[PDB]
């Protein structure tokens, strides 16, 4: 009886079998609906395309994300995401395998209630579990203690955990992640005359942000380098055949993570968020958290983030204690890898939320069982 | 609507029979929006759809209750706290103007 690990993040659904090393099904969480007039009769024209089929046929569809800012807004769309990742991607019946699910910290509880109700009534498993994403990101780092900066597509949160105990008062949350970076890149790509307004153009701008953007080490030196000479310019070929060229906007797009005043957010950067989350803890446990900065999520996949993070934390913290940044290359699927580590354990057999516990306590035992 | 609340209480007590909510004398009115989430075995109809089919078949006099509740749509958007803060600011400004009348010179 192999379990299933299914990270239903804001960015991409990452689902597969427990005990494995890489997830079997990685696909973006969008629901595409047709907006034009259907003229050809027959041939099986569906009213809703879910998953990669919406990405392939995105030139005639309006795309709706069922998860916005880490909170599941639309529920029938999320049921279509769960039905596609159970019946079509993994091609297994969901009622014979236990399922682990991930959840953001500081969540409203009715999200957990409706997730438990949907997984126990629509896709009624014998057993399930809801886990925190930062605990699974720290479990896949080969350790137990440390602080996780988990930055998905909507939520960037710092959670410090000391000796397996997740401190709740030091959890900090900032609503600035890769969708807002994509929208800021759509805002600053119009400065060169390349207008992008549709939802289908957001995937092209997100591909540009994935392939060409990078985190600078110094902002002013790189801005003076791009203003001095045109050596940092890079070209991109659009799917219709047009070629665009960008300069400083490769590094101004992830500069919002370290300067959140660019899109008008009052809170400070993620290094200051990490510093205030560590400084909310005890004074005796800070030296372990200074050397255990573990990063996760697809937003931390830039090839400049670790040096800038180490320089900003070393400028923030006193120099007597060692500053180390942990950046594994498998951090895109580290939540799924930690879920596959936690699901296969023999100590986890007593921590399952069974069908009889749901029948006794309703869909509310997940608040008192989990953290 | 009271006959609908009696009908929902009878059907839901039969559904919750043997559970924690068995023999329920009443339920909260905020739970009425959560009647849609109780799906069937084949997931084609809801508990709301079963109650709408039951009122269409047996008791069709229930169904005129949207016509009686006309001003509920207007009452859903009106805040009592903002009405209290506006009336307190109105009473303060009337008392401020009347004090300015009494402190006005010749």
């Amino acid at each position: 009886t192999t379990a299933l690990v299914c990270d239903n993040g804001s960015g991409l659904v990452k689902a597969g079998f427990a005990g494995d090393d890489a997830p079997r099904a990685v696909f973006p969480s969008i629901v595409g609906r047709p907006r034009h007039q259907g003229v050809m009769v027959g041939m099986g024209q569906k009213d809703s395309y879910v998953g990669d089929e919406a990405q392939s046929k995105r030139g005639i569809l309006t795309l709706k994300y069922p998860i916005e800012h880490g909170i599941i807004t639309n529920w029938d769309d999320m049921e279509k995401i769960w039905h596609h990742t159970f019946y079509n991607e993994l091609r297994v019946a969901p009622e014979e395998h236990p399922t682990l699910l991930t959840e953001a910290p500081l969540n409203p509880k009715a999200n957990r209630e409706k997730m438990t109700q949907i997984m126990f009534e629509t896709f009624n498993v014998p057993a399930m579990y809801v886990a925190i994403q930062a605990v699974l990101s720290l479990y896949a780092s080969g350790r137990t203690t440390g602080i996780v900066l988990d930055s998905g597509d909507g939520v960037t949160h710092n959670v410090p955990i000391y000796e397996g105990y997740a401190l709740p008062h030091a959890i900090m949350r900032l609503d600035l992640a890769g969708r807002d970076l994509t929208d800021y890149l759509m805002k600053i790509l119009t400065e060169r005359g390349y207008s992008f307004v549709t939802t289908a153009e957001r995937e092209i701008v997100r591909d540009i942000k994935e392939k060409l953007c990078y985190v600078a080490l110094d902002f002013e030196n790189e801005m003076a380098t791009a203003a001095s000479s045109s050596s940092l310019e890079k070209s991109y070929e659009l799917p219709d055949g047009q070629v665009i060229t960008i300069g400083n906007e490769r590094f101004r797009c992830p500069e919002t993570l370290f300067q959140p005043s660019f899109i008008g957010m009052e809170s400070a950067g993620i290094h200051e968020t990490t510093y205030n989350s560590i400084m909310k803890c005890d004074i005796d446990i800070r030296k372990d958290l200074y050397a255990n900065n573990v990063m996760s999520g697809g937003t931390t996949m830039y090839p400049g983030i670790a040096d800038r993070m180490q320089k900003e934390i070393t400028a923030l913290a006193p120099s007597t204690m060692k500053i180390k940044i942990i950046a594994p290359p498998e951090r895109k699927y580290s939540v799924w890898i930690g879920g596959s580590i936690l699901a296969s354990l023999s100590t986890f057999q007593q921590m399952w939320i069974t069908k009889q516990e749901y029948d006794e306590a309703g869909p509310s035992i997940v608040h008192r069982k989990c953290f | 609507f009271s006959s609908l609340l009696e009908l929902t209480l009878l059907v839901g007590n039969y559904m919750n029979a043997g559970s924690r909510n068995a023999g329920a004398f009443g339920f909260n009115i905020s739970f009425l929006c959560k009647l849609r989430d109780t799906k069937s075995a084949d997931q084609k109809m809801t508990l709301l759809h079963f109650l709408a089919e039951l009122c269409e078949n047996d008791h069709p006099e229930v169904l005129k209750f949207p016509d009686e509740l006309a001003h509920v749509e207007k009452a859903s958007r009106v805040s009592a706290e903002n009405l209290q803060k506006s009336l307190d600011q109105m009473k303060k400004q009337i008392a401020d103007v009347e004090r300015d009348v009494q402190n006005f010179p010749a």
Binding site: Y139, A140, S141, G142, T347 | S40, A41, L47, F50
Partner: peptide, 22 residues
């Protein structure tokens, strides 16, 4: 209605997480 709506411990845990990672 029947036809329609029919239905120590801390060190051993942290070592098991460490052995599951390794």
């Amino acid at each position: 209605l029947t036809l329609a709506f029919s239905a120590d411990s801390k060190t051993a845990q942290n070592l098991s997480i460490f052995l599951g990672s390794f």
